[PDB]
Amino acid sequence: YKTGMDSPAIKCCGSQECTPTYRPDEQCKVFTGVYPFMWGGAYCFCDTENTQVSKAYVMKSDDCLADHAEAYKAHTASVQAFLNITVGEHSIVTTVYV
C-alpha cells in the first residue's frame, strides 16, 4: 500500500470541519490549539483557536503492476498429454486430451 496524505488545512482564529471523500480507509481528524511554523516565520498571529486538519487515506503503490500477487480458486482439473503414437509404422505426434 501507499498511505497518501493531504496537506494540512490551516485556518487562523477559525474552525475547520471534516468533509469526507470515501477514499479507502480514509481517516480524518480536526486538531485545535496549533501554532504552526513555516520557513519564513510563524504562520498565524493567534495564540489559540487555530485549527489544523489531518486527512490520510490508503492507495496502492506505484509498482503494483509488475509486483503483485494473484489470489485464485482452483477446482476440477483437466489432464492433457503430448503423446507420440506409432501404430503399424505410421507415427503421429498429437496433443491428446485424456
Partner: protein, 314 residues
C-alpha cells in the same frame, strides 16, 4: 525524445519541507525526503525528495528552493549514504535513483560555500538478493535469473502522483518597520497579502507597492504571505494547502519497477557419496545457501534449510 518526458516537471517548482535531522538540529530543508522505496533486487532505491532533477534554475543537476529563490548545483556535489556511501545514478523530476547498501537510515547532503545542508530520515533501506543463495554484494559471475529492478530511464508508464496549488508560504523578510509604522514590501512580479490585528480585523491584498499601514506599531502583529498562482508543488503533508478544490493535475513517476535479468552466484558443487538406498551430501557453502530436498512419492517429506557452514547431510 527526452524533452517530451521532461516537459511536465516544467510546470512544477522545488520547495522546502521540514527535515527532522539537519546538520545541527531540526530545520526546514531544501533537500527533504518524502519516501524511500527499496523493493528492487540488486540494491537500487528510488527517493522522492523535495528537490528537482534534470532541470536548470541541464543534464546532471539538482534544483532546489532556497528561501524562495530557486538555486542549482551539479549532481556530483550531492552525495547520500545509508551505512556505506550510495551512488547516484540519474534523476528526473522529484525522483532520484541510487545504488544503495542496506541500512536503517538515509542521509542526503550537499555542500555550498560555508553552509552544509543535510537531511537524515529514519527510513529503512533493505537489500534483496535473487535466488536461493543469500549474498550481500552482487557477484562477478554465475547464471542469470529473471528479476525486478527499478528501470533507469524516465519513460512514461501508468503510475502517477498528484499535483496541487501551492498554498500561502508566509514570509517575514517582507514586513519591516518604518520610523513609526509597519511597512510591507512585496517582491517584483509577485503579489503578497497582509493580515494584521492592530485595529479591528484588518486584511489586504497588495501588488508591487511598498505599502505602509497606520495604527500598527509592532510588526509582530502582521503576517505577510506570498502567492504564486503558477508553478505546481507536490501534494505534500509538509506544506499547507490552498482554499478550494486544490487540484491542478497529475504527473507520471520515473524509474518504475520493471522486469529484468540479474546475475546470481553459483554455489560450489556438492560432493555426493552413494550407498545402498542412501545418499550423503558434503556441502561447503561460500555464502549462505538454501538446500531444498523432497521425495517423489505420495508423502514428499520436504526439507528446507539455510546452510551457511560446512555441513554433511544424509
Amino acid at each position: 525524445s527526452t524533452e517530451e518526458l521532461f516537459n511536465e516537471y516544467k510546470l512544477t517548482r522545488p520547495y522546502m519541507a521540514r527535515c527532522i535531522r539537519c546538520a545541527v538540529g531540526s530545520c526546514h530543508s531544501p533537500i527533504a525526503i518524502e519516501a524511500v522505496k527499496s523493493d528492487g533486487h540488486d540494491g537500487y532505491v528510488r527517493l522522492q525528495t523535495s528537490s528537482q532533477y534534470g532541470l536548470d534554475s541541464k543534464g546532471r543537476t539538482m534544483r532546489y528552493d532556497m528561501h524562495g529563490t530557486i538555486k542549482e548545483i551539479p549532481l556530483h556535489q550531492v552525495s547520500l549514504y545509508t551505512s556505506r556511501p550510495c551512488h547516484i545514478v540519474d534523476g528526473h523530476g522529484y525522483f532520484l535513483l541510487a545504488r544503495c547498501p542496506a541500512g536503517d537510515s538515509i542521509t542526503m547532503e550537499f555542500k555550498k560555500d560555508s553552509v552544509r545542508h543535510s537531511c537524515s530520515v529514519p527510513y529503512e533501506v533493505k537489500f534483496n538478493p535473487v535466488g536461493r543463495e543469500l549474498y550481500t554484494h552482487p557477484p562477478e559471475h554465475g547464471v542469470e535469473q529473471a528479476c525486478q529492478v527499478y528501470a533507469h530511464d524516465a519513460q512514461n508508464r501508468g503510475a502517477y502522483v498528484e499535483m496541487h496549488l501551492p498554498g500561502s508560504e508566509v514570509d517575514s523578510s517582507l514586513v519591516s518597520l518604518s520610523g513609526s509604522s509597519v511597512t510591507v514590501t512585496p517582491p517584483d512580479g509577485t503579489s503578497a497579502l497582509v493580515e494584521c490585528e492592530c485595529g479591528g480585523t484588518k486584511i489586504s491584498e497588495t501588488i508591487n507597492k511598498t505599502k505602509q499601514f497606520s495604527q500598527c506599531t509592532k510588526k509582530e502583529q502582521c503576517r505577510a504571505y506570498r502567492l504564486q498562482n503558477d508553478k505546481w508543488v507536490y501534494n505534500s503533508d509538509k506544506l499547507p494547502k490552498a482554499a478550494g478544490a486544490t487540484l491542478k493535475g497529475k504527473l507520471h513517476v520515473p524509474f518504475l519497477l520493471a522486469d529484468g535479468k540479474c546475475t546470481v552466484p553459483l554455489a560450489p558443487e556438492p560432493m555426493i557419496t552413494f550407498g545402498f538406498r542412501s545418499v550423503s551430501l558434503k556441502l561447503h557453502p561460500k555464502n549462505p545457501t538454501y538446500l531444498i530436498t523432497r521425495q517423489l512419492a505420495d508423502e514428499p517429506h520436504y526439507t528446507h534449510e539455510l546452510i551457511s557452514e560446512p555441513a554433511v547431510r544424509n
